Symmetry: C2
């Protein structure tokens, strides 16, 4: 879903680096794919794609499928990767990530 608004090669390389189970690092991913340098406005767009059901939050089931928003055949994160990613982004502890949280996960 980003393929048009993130570069093709950046995505591929991002995915290749975390093909092994439990090798995912969201900072590593974000930097490589090129989202860290994006505008808060484009980051919000990115957010909406990940939030598959448009609930206004990225729930754990959506975080598990994070990579698949980038390349449809990407692997699911393991439970440990998902919990780690959740824990880093979920500032208020509601077990989900809201747009402001997402923005801080991407940029900081």
């Amino acid at each position: 879903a980003f393929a048009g608004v993130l570069n093709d090669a950046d995505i591929a390389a991002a995915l290749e680096a975390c093909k092994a189970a439990d090798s995912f690092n969201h900072k590593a991913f974000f930097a490589k794919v090129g989202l860290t340098s994006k505008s808060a406005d484009d980051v919000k767009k990115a957010f909406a794609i990940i939030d598959q059901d448009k609930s206004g939050f990225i729930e754990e089931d959506e975080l598990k499928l994070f990579l698949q928003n980038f390349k449809a055949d990407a692997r699911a994160l393991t439970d440990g990767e998902t919990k780690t990613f959740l824990k880093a982004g979920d500032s208020d502890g509601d077990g989900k990530i809201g747009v402001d949280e997402f923005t801080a996960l991407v940029k900081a």
Copy 2:
């Protein structure tokens, strides 16, 4: 110190993927640099290099400098990366990593 027993390109790419602060992932690193496919005997050799003082353990100060064993000018891990890496490898909770622990961190 591995440059002769790990490939040049693998190391470079491993380092490039984690240049950003807090982007380090030991599984990602290990897989890319090529240590995961090594013999328990070569893994022990790797261990001895990281254990800079030959105490028989990789203490936290040595883990912080992990990358520098691969390329001398590599960055130090942040405190958060080091704690995470320590926590994943330190099975017995003595705050350091022994060779068997290291072996399981690399292979599993």
